[PDB]
Structure formats: C-alpha cells, structure tokens
Amino acid sequence: GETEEEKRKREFEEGGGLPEQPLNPDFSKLNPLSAEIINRQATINIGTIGHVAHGKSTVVRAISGVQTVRFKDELERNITIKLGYANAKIYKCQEPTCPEPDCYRSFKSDKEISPKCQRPGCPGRYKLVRHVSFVDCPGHDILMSTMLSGAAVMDAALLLIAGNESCPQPQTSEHLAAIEIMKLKHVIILQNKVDLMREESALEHQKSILKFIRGTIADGAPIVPISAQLKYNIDAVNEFIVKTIPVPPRDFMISPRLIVIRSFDVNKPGAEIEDLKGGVAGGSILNGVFKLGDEIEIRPGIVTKDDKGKIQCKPIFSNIVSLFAEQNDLKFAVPGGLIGVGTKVDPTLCRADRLVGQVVGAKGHLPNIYTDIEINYFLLRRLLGVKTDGQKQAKVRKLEPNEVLMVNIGSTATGARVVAVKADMARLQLTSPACTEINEKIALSRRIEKHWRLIGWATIKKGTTLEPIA
C-alpha cells in the first residue's frame, strides 16, 4: 500500500538520515574515517583509465550509480574533455553469517547512513566504512592534459582492459606509466569484457596482462573481472578499494591549498537574474582544511599582455561564499577530495575551460609564480601509446632547444619553450604563467605524431619568480 518513495523515506529516517556537520568541530581530533567526516564527504579520489570505445562511464555508474554528463551535444558519445564526477559510499554488512564478498556495496549519495541489507534473508543494516569519489579520465591520444591533471589529483586508479580486443593496448600503458609518474601504486586492474569471453581465452588474456605488467613499478595490482551492462561484480571492487588502498598521508598541519580542474557558472536561464549565484571552482584539496567563509586567491589568476610584451599575472582574490560536497552544504573541508567551492568569483570567469588546473591559496600563504623554470626531467627509452606493426616501437628523442612541449605542472597545462638542454636538467620558458608550491610533479608531452605524447616525468628545482600586481 505504501508508495516506494515513502518506503525510501522510512529507510532513510531509520538509516540515520544525513547528520549535519558541526559548525566548529575539534579539528585536531578528526580523521578521514570519523563519522562527522565520512557521512557527507569523500576522502579518496579514484580515477578510471581505459581506451576509447571500452566503457568507463558505464563502469562508473555500475559502481557508484552517479552518471557522467557526457555533454556538449557533440561530445555525448565520442570523447569527453572535462573529467567525470561520481560518488559512491562504501558500506559493509556487520553480520558474520553473510559471505564477505557481498558484504560490501557502493551506494548513491543520498543513501542513508545505515540502510537495510538488500540481500534476502539478512535483516542487517549497512555500516559506512569509506566514502570515495570516482572520477573518469579521458583515454584519448589528444586528451592528455586533463588525463594527467586527474592522475595528479587521483589517489587510487582503475585500469580497464577489454578481453575480446587486442591484449596489448598502448593507451592503457600510457595511462599506467602516467600514474607511475606521479607516485601512485594503488591500481586495481579490471577486465570489462568477461561476458563475451571464453573459458580458456579469458585465462590467456589474463596471462597476457600479467606478462605485460612485469617491469613496471606497479607489481601487486589487483585484477578483477567486472561487468558494465549487467552491473555485477561491484562488491568485490568495494572490498579491494577498502583493502588494497589505505589512506594517503593528508592531515591538518599542512597549509591550505586547492587545485581546480573545472569551473562552473551557476546561472539558471529563464528565471530573472535577481536570484543568481556566484562562480564555482571545482577543485581538489590535496593539502589543508577549509571552512565556511574563508579568504582565498587564485595565484596564476588573470593572464594579460602589455604593449611591451610583458606577461602580467593577477591573483584572483575571492571570498569563499560556500563549499559544496556531493550531497549538501558542508561547514568544514576534508583534504583529499573534489569539492565545488562556490565563491564570489565571476560566473563569466567560470564560463569556459578557464580555471582548468589552477592552484589556489588561502590568504596568509604565498605560492610562487614563475616565468622561466629550472626543471629536472627524466625520459623513457620508448614512446608509449604508439601502435607499430611489429618493428621497434617508437624511440624517444632527446629534447632540443627552442622546442614547444606541453608540460603539465601538477595541474597547469603550459606550452614551454626550451632555452637550454643539459644532461638531466632544462630551462623552460612559459608564455602562460605557472606556479610552484612544494614539488608539483610534472608530466612531459611532446608533439611528434601531430598530437601530445607522454615522454617522461620531471620535477621543478628552481624558477625565475615574478611578483604579482595586487
């Protein structure tokens, strides 16, 4: 007799609803597994990598249930530029009787804290063990800047390989090596095509996968069959996420910082402009804790060119009006998660792909912007992502002076020009300004086959500073 919405509301109320975060909790006592932190904010960012026409948004919605938009009326089916966003709350069943593999379950953002166990015969609830944010990375040969920026943001990885297609996929190796660049070993390999794969052919494909990942830094990466259309084998993914991936070191003494990947203009059309909202910076906090109503500034900010050819950088000052997590308004920010900081920044400033991978620092801290950067780069022997028909896969050339190369400094995608080349170090001149705070591991890509190709990793060791104009 009762409607299904009434049933869901009753379960939500019995499940504890969504407890509201305290206005000023004791910050030094909070951990990424605390109830006030875990109930409304994710703590681990898990990225998805895979070839095009393989299925990652389908896998994401199978795991989390939050769909990726796949927008712009022309990027709906082919590729996506901006990373996808998804949210899954990991739950475990307390009862010892039910088997461990199906104890875990990833539930949507609006799921209750203690929802009922959907398994027939088990009257138990669910315990929220971890909150994770699932982000889709673009696996396309030209789509590397966004992919590398996401990999920088990511704390865990999921590689997707199609069993029925060719066993060695060079774009998968590209993404795996890019993840190896940025010091991330928590990778869970997943086979997308298990429904349409034979008994011995699947074993051969798994053996080939094990053969491929032998010399790479990642060694004990778990490998798990999953389904994207039948939407099975999700609980094992939750178990492996909980076990193989521990909490990255991220606590409260570090200075507050933000790395914005995407920007949104909050202005609903049709309704009169009298009721509008400011500008949203979609950023991950790799370090620091934020609250409601803080004072921040985007260090690279506005880029302008004078009549004399000088690059002026304006730090975009902004008061944080609010911070939005996946579900509702929060009062404090847990480090290591993607958050939409809705500030007084112009919605016009957050209109296009403008605030794509830019660093933001709170007032009382001075990240340093640079024009010429003294970098230390390491290359690989062979280019990854090239499909050669059985003859000596592409060989990496040493970088030449006065060559335009795409450098992803943690989040900033800049076209650097080589000033000089040394045995292991180089000088890069940037027309687009970029910052440096502590390390900001750098991904290097070269234009060889008409598109950006990853060549190796690099680290900033020095830079020619520029003093921003207030």
């Binding site: 298990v194 429904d195 094990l210 490998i223 798990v224 069959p225 099975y232 094992a236 492996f240």
Partner: peptide, 23 residues
C-alpha cells in the same frame, strides 16, 4: 597474484550460464 581473479571469473561464468541459457 591472480588468485582472486580466477574465483571471480568462475562466479561470473556460472552466473552468465545460469541466467542466460542461450549463451
């Protein structure tokens, strides 16, 4: 180690065989 892979793949195959006799 690929030990957790084999059991999960076998469970997947059993589920497909039972639910979809046409395959």
């Amino acid at each position: 180690v690929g030990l957790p892979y084999s059991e999960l793949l076998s469970r997947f195959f059993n589920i497909l065989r039972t639910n979809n006799p046409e395959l």
